[PDB]
RNA sequence: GAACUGAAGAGUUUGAUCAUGGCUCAGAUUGAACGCUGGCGGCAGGCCUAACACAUGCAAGUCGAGCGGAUGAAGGGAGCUUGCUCCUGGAUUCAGCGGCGGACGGGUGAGUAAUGCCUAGGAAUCUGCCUGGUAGUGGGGGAUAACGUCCGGAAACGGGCG
RNA sequence: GGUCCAGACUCCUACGGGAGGCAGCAGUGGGGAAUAUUGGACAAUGGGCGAAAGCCUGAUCCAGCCAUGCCGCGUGUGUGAAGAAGGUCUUCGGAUUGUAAAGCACUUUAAGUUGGGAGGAAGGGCAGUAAGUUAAUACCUUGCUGUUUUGACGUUACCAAC
């Protein structure tokens, strides 16, 4: 299949593997990055929730 | 101690200063003892850049009040004119 | 905001001239200005005292083209000032920059003078002003920017202001389009049909 | 020269009327919320409820010109030989003792009906650093942290001797 | 944002044994109709220490979000009667939407792109000179002179061109 990932310098794009609510740090989303690179302090749009990543 | 410093008023990016005699352990814009003039960093037009009471300033300096660095420079400039 | 739309239904509803077109051709031969706008135009419908006061205020506002909140501010300032708020309101309305540019013949109407002022083509004391609310003081010199002195709009506006009546409180220097504001025009310098007593009565309730 | 200048009523009880009397409405304001809609800028404001419980970062340190100690540059060189060793010197950095600061700045309104707050008074007090005067800083003593040493503890760290 | 004791509640643990206090700034859960960013810098004004460079500062100065409020400005301007086409009403004559639209001709504020461009900055290091202090052209303090060096906001306010 040659497993070509396109550039790792593209804006991040991935899918949610699971999600939960933590009483100390709010909604936590376990996401599998598909292509691009995800960096801390980045505006993320997932489903209907949006926001930017305080932590990763 | 008792100091003479600048209390900041005015608005965003437009500062105005009151030359105030305060106990040192007070808020910058809190309670004071006496105001002895003002300083205008922008001025222009009919506005004056700085004005001080010579009498009150000398009286308070004679009573052991320590002016700040800006107050020292501005007061010596006012005494120059 | 600004009222943008048919600028002649206002004259028909108010029932007076209420200058909003350039006045070039006429008013009667454009709209049959004898009926209120809409389907029920032929009905007369004598109205009540509150209606008369409301119509007077609306007529003044639509003459000078200002909205309700700014007009309330003008009323509050006129009440604050000394000497008979009734004509204080007119003194204050007659000093706006767009109105002054209109009176000097630079624009055909108030909307076109607003167009000129807002688009940075007018200097008051040798420096650019583009706020159509700037209260010009006695002795200012309204002029036209040199890069904006060749617009035709000013040419037609001047040649048509040449015949509408002598304002006799601003001196226009026609050759190079420079003016002068001698003073605010007193109540006797304006038309004696506006009943500002109705406006003061309406707001004092 | 100024510091003001100021006061509207209406609907509804009856076949109709006057009075009494309630209800309702027309105004101005919010630390506002909701519904529909939404271009820009300037200046402000933003847990009013649970003084409910809190993951994670930061919010109070500084002084080597008070004091031992250990870290030990560049260099002058000395030897052997390309680089090392040695010495003198030594610049920088601080774990510890010690001096100040930490009682300020920042948050909240639970308690409090009067040891609180506001206004006007007074008499019996203290007050680092700050200002101006007055008189001085002469000479000894015993310690102790750091450190070395000996055990226990998963660690946190603790204990005895010099 | 110190100590000791007791208590309620969470947690660690190697089961021997300890730790904690966001009504500081961000942030989370919960309650609620409802109230925001794990942002940047100590450049400015202040505060602590220092002798002085200087270090620290979620005070502060600023940025982010939200029509929450106040204020200001835009969404074009003039001419234009076949009184167009469509809609609506009609006494079927017509009226009205309406100079409104189209057509014709003008303007480019705000927003977009490009290029210029202040003010917030006082000071600090070095070098020289002159006065005062002594006992002294020393050290040091103070005037002045020359050189060098400082801005988070920030792609600043503002200005010019398409
Ligand atoms: Mg508005
Ligand atoms: Mg009845
Ligand atoms: Mg609260
Ligand atoms: Mg140290
Ligand atoms: Mg306080
Ligand atoms: Mg309370
Ligand atoms: Mg009680
Ligand atoms: Mg705390
Ligand atoms: Mg908080
Ligand atoms: Mg609590
Ligand atoms: Mg809830
Ligand atoms: Mg809300
Ligand atoms: Mg600072
Ligand atoms: Mg140091
Ligand atoms: Mg820190
Ligand atoms: Mg910070
Ligand atoms: Mg806004
Ligand atoms: Mg809303
Ligand atoms: Mg038709
Ligand atoms: Mg500058």
Curated annotation (Swiss-Prot), chain A:
It is found in: Cytoplasm. One of the essential components for the initiation of protein synthesis. Protects formylmethionyl-tRNA from spontaneous hydrolysis and promotes its binding to the 30S ribosomal subunits. Also involved in the hydrolysis of GTP during the formation of the 70S ribosomal complex. Belongs to the TRAFAC class translation factor GTPase superfamily. Classic translation factor GTPase family. IF-2 subfamily. This is Translation initiation factor IF-2.
UniProtKB/Swiss-Prot annotation, chain B:
The lineage of its organism: Bacteria, Pseudomonadati, Pseudomonadota, Gammaproteobacteria, Pseudomonadales. One of its GO terms (cellular component) is cytoplasm. Keywords: Ribonucleoprotein, Ribosomal protein. GO terms for biological process: translation. SUPFAM superfamilies: Ribosomal protein S16. GO terms for molecular function: structural constituent of ribosome. The keyword Ribonucleoprotein applies. Belongs to the bacterial ribosomal protein bS16 family. This is Small ribosomal subunit protein bS16. It comes from Pseudomonas aeruginosa (strain ATCC 15692 / DSM 22644 / CIP 104116 / JCM 14847 / LMG 12228 / 1C / PRS 101 / PAO1).
From Swiss-Prot, chain C:
GO terms for cellular component: small ribosomal subunit. InterPro entries: Ribosomal_uS4 (IPR022801), Ribosomal_uS4_bac-type (IPR005709), Ribosomal_uS4_CS (IPR018079), Ribosomal_uS4_N (IPR001912), S4_RNA-bd (IPR002942), S4_RNA-bd_sf (IPR036986). This is Small ribosomal subunit protein uS4. The keyword Ribosomal protein applies. It comes from Pseudomonas aeruginosa (strain ATCC 15692 / DSM 22644 / CIP 104116 / JCM 14847 / LMG 12228 / 1C / PRS 101 / PAO1). It holds the Pfam family S4. One of its GO terms (molecular function) is rRNA binding. Part of the 30S ribosomal subunit. Contacts protein S5. The interaction surface between S4 and S5 is involved in control of translational fidelity. Keywords: Ribonucleoprotein, Ribosomal protein, RNA-binding, rRNA-binding. One of the primary rRNA binding proteins, it binds directly to 16S rRNA where it nucleates assembly of the body of the 30S subunit. GO terms for biological process: ribosomal small subunit biogenesis; translation. Belongs to the universal ribosomal protein uS4 family. Residues 95-155 form the S4 RNA-binding domain.
């Amino acid at each position: 299949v040659l497993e070509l990932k396109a550039t790792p310098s593209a804006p991040g794009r991935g899918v949610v593997v699971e999600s939960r609510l933590d009483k100390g740090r709010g909604p936590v989303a376990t996401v599998l990055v598909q292509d691009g690179t995800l960096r801390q302090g980045d505006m993320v749009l997932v489903g209907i929730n949006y926001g930017r990543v305080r932590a990763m | 101690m008792v100091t003479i410093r600048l209390a900041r008023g005015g608005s965003k990016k437009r500062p105005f200063y009151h030359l105030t005699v305060t106990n040192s352990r007070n808020a910058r814009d809190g309670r004071f003892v006496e105001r002895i003039g003002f300083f205008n960093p922008v001025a222009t037009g009919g506005e004056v850049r700085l004005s001080v009471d010579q009498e009150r300033a000398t009286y308070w300096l004679g009573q052991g009040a320590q002016p700040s660095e800006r107050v020292a420079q501005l007061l010596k400039d006012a005494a120059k004119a | 905001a600004r009222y943008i739309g048919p600028k002649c239904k206002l004259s028909r509803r108010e029932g007076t001239d209420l200058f909003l077109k350039s006045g070039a051709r006429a008013l009667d031969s454009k709209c049959k200005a004898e009926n209120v706008p809409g389907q029920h135009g032929q009905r007369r419908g004598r109205l009540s005292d509150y209606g008369l006061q409301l119509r007077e205020k609306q007529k003044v506002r639509r003459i000078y083209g200002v909205l309700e909140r700014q007009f309330r501010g003008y009323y509050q300032e006129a009440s604050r000032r000394k000497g008979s708020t009734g004509e204080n309101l007119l003194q204050l309305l007659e000093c706006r920059l767009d109105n002054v540019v209109y009176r000097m013949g630079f624009g055909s109407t108030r909307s076109e003078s607003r167009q000129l002022v807002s688009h940075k083509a007018i200097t008051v004391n040798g420096q650019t002003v583009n706020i159509p609310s700037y209260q010009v003081k006695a002795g200012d010199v309204v002029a036209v920017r040199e890069k904006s002195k060749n617009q035709l709009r000013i040419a037609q506006a001047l040649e048509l202001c040449g015949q509408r009546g002598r304002v006799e409180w601003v001196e226009v220097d026609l050759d190079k389009k420079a003016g002068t504001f001698k003073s605010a025009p007193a109540r006797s310098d304006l038309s004696a049909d506006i009943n500002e007593n109705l406006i003061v009565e309406l707001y004092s309730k």
